Amino acid sequence: XHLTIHTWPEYGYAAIDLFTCGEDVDPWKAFEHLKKALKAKRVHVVEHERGRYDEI
Amino acid sequence: XHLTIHTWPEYGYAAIDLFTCGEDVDPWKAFEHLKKALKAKRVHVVEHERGRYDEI
Amino acid sequence: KSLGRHLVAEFYECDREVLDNVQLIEQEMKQAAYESGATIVTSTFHRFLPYGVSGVVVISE
Amino acid sequence: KSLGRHLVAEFYECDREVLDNVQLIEQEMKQAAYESGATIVTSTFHRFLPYGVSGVVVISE
Numbered sequence A, B: 001x002h003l004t005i006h007t008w009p010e011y012g013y014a015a016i017d018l019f020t021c022g023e024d025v026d027p028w029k030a031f032e033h034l035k036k037a038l039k040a041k042r043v044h045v046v047e048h049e050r051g052r053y054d055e056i
Numbered sequence C, D: 001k002s003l004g005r006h007l008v009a010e011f012y013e014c015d016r017e018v019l020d021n022v023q024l025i026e027q028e029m030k031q032a033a034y035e036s037g038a039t040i041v042t043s044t045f046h047r048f049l050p051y052g053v054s055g056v057v058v059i060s061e
């Protein structure tokens, strides 16, 4: 899966989640597009590995 | 906001996200209900603060 | 301290039958949203093939 | 490595008009899904009052 967005126009803030599955899908492309589209001037990103092979 | 779930029955795995806003909403109450329903026997949870006041 | 709290959870060794049940997952997800004290705005659940379920519950303060 | 990759992002100092435009947000979220190489399963966007936009694009493959 999913791509989500929750905005707070009052604070110029948007909570964005880019959760993709498989190797042929790159969430960073989605990030690049949204950063540009929203005109964000500062960002903080945490990358998680969902369903780590050695955990499952 | 949102509560999301993506399951991989073939691995007995589920990626869950519980993003709530406000003092009236407790994301851990949701976590507890799902942990029971899905009968998970091993869990890892990280709590993120979204939209920190000292940042926005 | 923050506008929202976000839990990112990894569930392992779940009941495989429950995981592949789009109906049961929808019920539990909505019930989970009620437990948290949130207001459900809308929800969408998809059943993947041959197996797999995806569900989203949009909530509000 | 892992079944999926998940970016948890905080966007600051955005164009406030864009953040409150539900039609534009939906358009841009669908484009981002397209740019990442993902397939669009379902889409749902809510316009909050007096201001605010929540949105979800369930993807796959």
Ligand SMILES: C[SH](C)C[C@H]1O[C@@H](n2cnc3c(N)ncnc32)[C@H](O)[C@@H]1O
Binding pocket: A001, A021, B006, B007, B008, B009, B010, C048, C049, C050, C051, C052, C053, C054, D060, D061
């Ligand atoms: C719910 S999902 C995120 C994961 C489950 O869906 C099955 N599946 C079915 N088709 C796809 C696809 N095109 N891309 C990703 N997963 C797929 C997975 O095997 C998993 O059970």
Ligand SMILES: C[SH](C)C[C@H]1O[C@@H](n2cnc3c(N)ncnc32)[C@H](O)[C@@H]1O
Binding pocket: A006, A007, A008, A009, A010, B001, B021, C060, C061, D048, D049, D050, D051, D052, D053, D054
């Ligand atoms: C999209 S949201 C999570 C945040 C934006 O929606 C406005 N809003 C309006 N009413 C609600 C409500 N009942 N619960 C949550 N947010 C509300 C927020 O002010 C923000 O702009």
